[PDB]
Amino acid sequence: QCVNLRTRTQLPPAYTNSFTRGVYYPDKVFRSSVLHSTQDLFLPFFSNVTWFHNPVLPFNDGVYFASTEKSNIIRGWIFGTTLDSKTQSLLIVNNATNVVIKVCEFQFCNDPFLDVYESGVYSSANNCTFEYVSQPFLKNLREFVFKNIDGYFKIYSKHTPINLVRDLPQGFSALEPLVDLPIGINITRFQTLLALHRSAAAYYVGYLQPRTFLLKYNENGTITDAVDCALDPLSE
Amino acid sequence: TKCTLKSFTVEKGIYQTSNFRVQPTESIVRFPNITNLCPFGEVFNATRFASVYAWNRKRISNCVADYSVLYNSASFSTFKCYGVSPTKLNDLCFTNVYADSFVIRGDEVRQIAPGQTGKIADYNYKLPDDFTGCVIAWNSNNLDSKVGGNYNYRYRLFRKSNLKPFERDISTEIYQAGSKPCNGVEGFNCYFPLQSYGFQPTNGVGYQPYRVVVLSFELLHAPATVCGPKKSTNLVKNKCVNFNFNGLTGTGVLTESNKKFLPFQQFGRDIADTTDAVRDPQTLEILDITPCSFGGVSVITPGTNTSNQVAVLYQGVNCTEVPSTGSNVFQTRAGCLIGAEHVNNSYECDIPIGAGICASYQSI
Numbered sequence A: 001q002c003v004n005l006r007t008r009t010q011l012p013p014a015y016t017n018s019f020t021r022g023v024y025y026p027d028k029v030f031r032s033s034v035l036h037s038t039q040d041l042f043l044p045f046f047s048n049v050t051w052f053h054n055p056v057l058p059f060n061d062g063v064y065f066a067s068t069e070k071s072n073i074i075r076g077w078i079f080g081t082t083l084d085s086k087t088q089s090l091l092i093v094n095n096a097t098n099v100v101i102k103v104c105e106f107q108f109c110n111d112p113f114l115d116v117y118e119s120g121v122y123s124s125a126n127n128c129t130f131e132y133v134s135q136p137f138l139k140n141l142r143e144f145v146f147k148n149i150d151g152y153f154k155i156y157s158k159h160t161p162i163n164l165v166r167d168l169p170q171g172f173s174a175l176e177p178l179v180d181l182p183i184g185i186n187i188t189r190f191q192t193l194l195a196l197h198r199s200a201a202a203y204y205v206g207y208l209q210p211r212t213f214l215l216k217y218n219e220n221g222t223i224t225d226a227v228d229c230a231l232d233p234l235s236e
Numbered sequence B: 001t002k003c004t005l006k007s008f009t010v011e012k013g014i015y016q017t018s019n020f021r022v023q024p025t026e027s028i029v030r031f032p033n034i035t036n037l038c039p040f041g042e043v044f045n046a047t048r049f050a051s052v053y054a055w056n057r058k059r060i061s062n063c064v065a066d067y068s069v070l071y072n073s074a075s076f077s078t079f080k081c082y083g084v085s086p087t088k089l090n091d092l093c094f095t096n097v098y099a100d101s102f103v104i105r106g107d108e109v110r111q112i113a114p115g116q117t118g119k120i121a122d123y124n125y126k127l128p129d130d131f132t133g134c135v136i137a138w139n140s141n142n143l144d145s146k147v148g149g150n151y152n153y154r155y156r157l158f159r160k161s162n163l164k165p166f167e168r169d170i171s172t173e174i175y176q177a178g179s180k181p182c183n184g185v186e187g188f189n190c191y192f193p194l195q196s197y198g199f200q201p202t203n204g205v206g207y208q209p210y211r212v213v214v215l216s217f218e219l220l221h222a223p224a225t226v227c228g229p230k231k232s233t234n235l236v237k238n239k240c241v242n243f244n245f246n247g248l249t250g251t252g253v254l255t256e257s258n259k260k261f262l263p264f265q266q267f268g269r270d271i272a273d274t275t276d277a278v279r280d281p282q283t284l285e286i287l288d289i290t291p292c293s294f295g296g297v298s299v300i301t302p303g304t305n306t307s308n309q310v311a312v313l314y315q316g317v318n319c320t321e322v323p324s325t326g327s328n329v330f331q332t333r334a335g336c337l338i339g340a341e342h343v344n345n346s347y348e349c350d351i352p353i354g355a356g357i358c359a360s361y362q363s364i
Ligand SMILES: *[C@@H]1O[C@H](CO)[C@@H](O[C@@H]2O[C@H](CO)[C@@H](O)[C@H](O)[C@H]2NC(C)=O)[C@H](O)[C@H]1NC(C)=O
Pocket: A095, A096, A097, A098, A099, A100, A118, A133
């Protein structure tokens, strides 16, 4: 049921500034009105993030995903190493009612997409291991952070009402932890899933690196400001 | 005081002898409501069980299963656990469980065991010698056996090779015992490997059908998922006790706190990375932890020559848990004092105590 489209989806790979986005709560510890320095994986401040207007991209240590979403065009994500039935593959789909997560040796087509008139992008579902169902994730700004360490897959999410024209806004907002998976996979590449109807979506991608940050906790325990210690000497 | 000073005479003054602390009373634990029970009811109470050579395989992972109810149940004829003892199975657990359910004869229950050989143990199902898990067998004569002949059940009888551990064979190939080829038709040296079971309600002990479920436990590097719930007791407040809140162990007194945890934190620390607040997994409320009182003690004496009675000062301790009666007990900014009476006059300071007050001998 899966066929390759004619026109090439050569979305322009532009570049833009990261500014001060990509900060998440490192743990579930409550702190009130205190400055804490922690070393972990973060997106460096004022970095260079890639803008797409869908080639397979390497996963590396962690991935920061940003979407100027309108009417929920992006629908799912694919994670794996060989992207076939020879290795376990992780599939996430946020359909109209719920979110479904599967860990199976699927057989994906060359150009998988949701198809509208649920899941048909895979020809086979062999040796399924883990299944999960939860509430749906989604002119809105959707921010996600995906990490995979020591057999644990961590997903952080944030939703924002935005009205800016083109690029990321100049602001600060922490990413609360959303989903944890106790499944051991060595994902190296990932993919995006589109709700394309047979008859232009843009997003931002950034990578993570290990570094030290200084976080400020207010009275109520919400992160309100952060400082990167590897930046200009004033920051150090 | 004499032992500390290492002398038989003591001059007037205040001396620091030892320390004091409040011992814990009891131990409490707290764990969440523990839900999502494993669906073991549909397996042990299934309407029908499959054959020995077509055993049903079920995967158990990511749930909670109570082994006490099945261990204490008397409906199981044989309950043999090889890897671990059944009593300790409720605590220790592995990353996944595989349930293999089938029906055999009464005499074939021993064949389904590690290091066992036989017709069933070699042609229908095989168990490894180092198998870890449990086997539960119960008589099913009243249910599986048919007066008209429960011939739906079948067992393998002939195969060229044996069976590997955890291997299921459902092939219907015509076994050729001899060297005479057969074109799919049974002959002198060709017979059907499968024989139907002839269970009857009244057939004697040994020939009755027996439903057997083997739980094989595997501990792949994935974290363990399925095992018994953690027992939790009621919390005790306003007492210096030791607690084990969801694996966090700490000794102190527990009070009600007005902190406003954001809905994803569990416990909090103020500074220097020491816990001060915690949220209980059951009630979902914020509680405060305070180390129970401790401090040094001191003795005030007017000199061994002058008199023979002394007073005792506990430093930085509220006058609520002193132990022991002596005289009237006084509460001061420096702590609590036992053995002296408070007056309203004001004289020169003889034996300094603190907070602008001191004691003297007149009694003390
Ligand atoms: C969106 O996804 C949900 C989650 O899988 C679907 O709900 C399931 O629907 C099937 C068949 O309709 C049922 O057998 C399941 O029991 C449902 N699961 C839950 C948790 O309710 C839903 O059908 C999907 N919607 C569309 C339009 O594909």
